Design a protein around this ligand. Sequence first.
Ligand code: ZN
Lengths: 176, 60, 80, 113, 77
Amino acid sequence: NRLKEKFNTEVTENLMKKFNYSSVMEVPKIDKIVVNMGVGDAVQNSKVLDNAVEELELITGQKPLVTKAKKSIATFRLREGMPIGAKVTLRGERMYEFLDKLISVSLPRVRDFQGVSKKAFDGRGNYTLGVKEQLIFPEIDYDKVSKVRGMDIVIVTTANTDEEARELLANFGMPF
Amino acid sequence: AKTSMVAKQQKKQKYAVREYTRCERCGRPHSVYRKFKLCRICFRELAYKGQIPGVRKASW
Amino acid sequence: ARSIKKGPFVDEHLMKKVEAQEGSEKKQVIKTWSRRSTIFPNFIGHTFAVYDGRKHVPVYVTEDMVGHKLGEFAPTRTFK
Amino acid sequence: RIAGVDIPREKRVVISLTYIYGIGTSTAQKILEEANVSADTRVKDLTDDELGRIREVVDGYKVEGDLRRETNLNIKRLMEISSYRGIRHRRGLPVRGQKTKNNARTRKGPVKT
Amino acid sequence: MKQGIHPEYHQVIFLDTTTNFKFLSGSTKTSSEMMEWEDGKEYPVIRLDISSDSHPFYTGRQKFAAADGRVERFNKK
RNA sequence: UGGGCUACACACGUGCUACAAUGGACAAUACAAAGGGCAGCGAAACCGCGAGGUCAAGCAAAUCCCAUAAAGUUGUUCUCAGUUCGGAUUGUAGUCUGCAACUCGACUACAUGAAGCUGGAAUCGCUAGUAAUCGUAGAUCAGCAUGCUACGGUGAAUACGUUC
Ligand SMILES: [Zn+2]
């Protein structure tokens, strides 16, 4: 829990001094991390989705929830209820471990890495990072990767403003 | 051959490996003998005219 | 050239252009026609727009690309 | 049985040692001369001390599965860097600049008329 | 958590060999090698070629080539 | 300047290499002819297992060099096996030419060791120093020949006949 200790000790104080919070309860914290992978091609080959779920499970450490089509779409040849994605929710220690790992071991492994988008904020203090190769993550061996596909990592924070979310993520160590 | 090509062959080449031989009578790039600096066609014509010292039809 | 007794070949103009602006971290893309130039460790992290015949393909140099020619990463023929 | 692979029992030692992946005729002769052993003696008529010396010499030549892994790693590296040789390895075409209009069967598989 | 559904998870020390820098965190990589840590308990170690303290973009410095690498062999040539 | 002419699901012609015991491997030892050589032929010696590198004699030619021909002969081994056959394929590491071998040269060392176990319909050359096999040299050419043009070594079978 090195990242959690950092947040409790340094980040809390820095952010509180920076934003002039009358109480400590206003200090933003990372509420959760949702790792989603949308597999549209599961329509044509469910085995793709199975491999994607296995890889996501290896990355995260907990079985992912299989997300199914909310509605039918003729153009995609998609029927309602067909599993076309996977999702993992990370909270607490597992969340912090995954976050520090993503910052330190995984992200630098991106070819020609030059930082992550600083504008990729929903507008309310939540940050979405679109990784484009699962091979970035250290837990996956490229030998067993039948296809390369990306992920979406949504860091949902209690910050009310993109400014505060940026400050928190920067203090945590997010490149920009 | 093209006059510009003949001129480019005569001119000095910045490389040294970039030097190639052309028949000096007509300019054919292919099948040029070194001893005569002639292509096979010009060699045959001049041998028939008898204007290549010591060159005659062979047989054995 | 290829023989070890001769150092790995690289165009002097290409090498000096790479060396220029080495200190600055805002390294830019280098236009080059030198498909024959070898990739030195000095090239790691650089972007070379290598002419493949009609257009300059961008090539990003990594450590594993050291020792190869810049032309090996700008294919010339198109098939399917 | 050397390097975890059995070798023909009735074959001379020098020839039989070539059955080890990574061991050819030249390396077989060199190993046999380093670990003093008769060239013509068959492996079946061989001494345990000779077999141990042969194993000792062989273990460090980096043969068999390690050699295979190294070759595969090289091929995978040249495929991953997106080299010309890598593209040709992916497409199963000759890598060393042959002509594919004809006579490329050993790389392209059987003829698909 | 539920029992028997999640993959096995345990602490590991990721080690950036370039800078010989060690960080402790959970994962499922499960390397055989084991190294001691400041807390009395030992945990396995995951070798890492490039990390935050070693990537040029994070560090602000040029990365250092490792031994037995392409650059090393090229300079030996 | 760089890239095509060197592409590649395919079909055809011409060849090179083989499928083995009339052979493969290892060591020793003979017998040709015809050509080329000036900034070209590069002897001997030393170095490297190797392709090759350093020094360097002779030679503008019946003088010196290219340049030790191979098949063959004599000894050991394999014993009818996809093998001690066959060498495509690709990994790594070298040599040489060229300002430069990525596309796209040749060769060398180590390893890898595919098909192929005399080939359906059909079809080709050849009447004797011919066919078949074995090497050798030269034009082009910095480098690059399984092509082309010449040279010799060993050296056959058959032609009844004109029905088709
Ligand atoms: Zn002419």
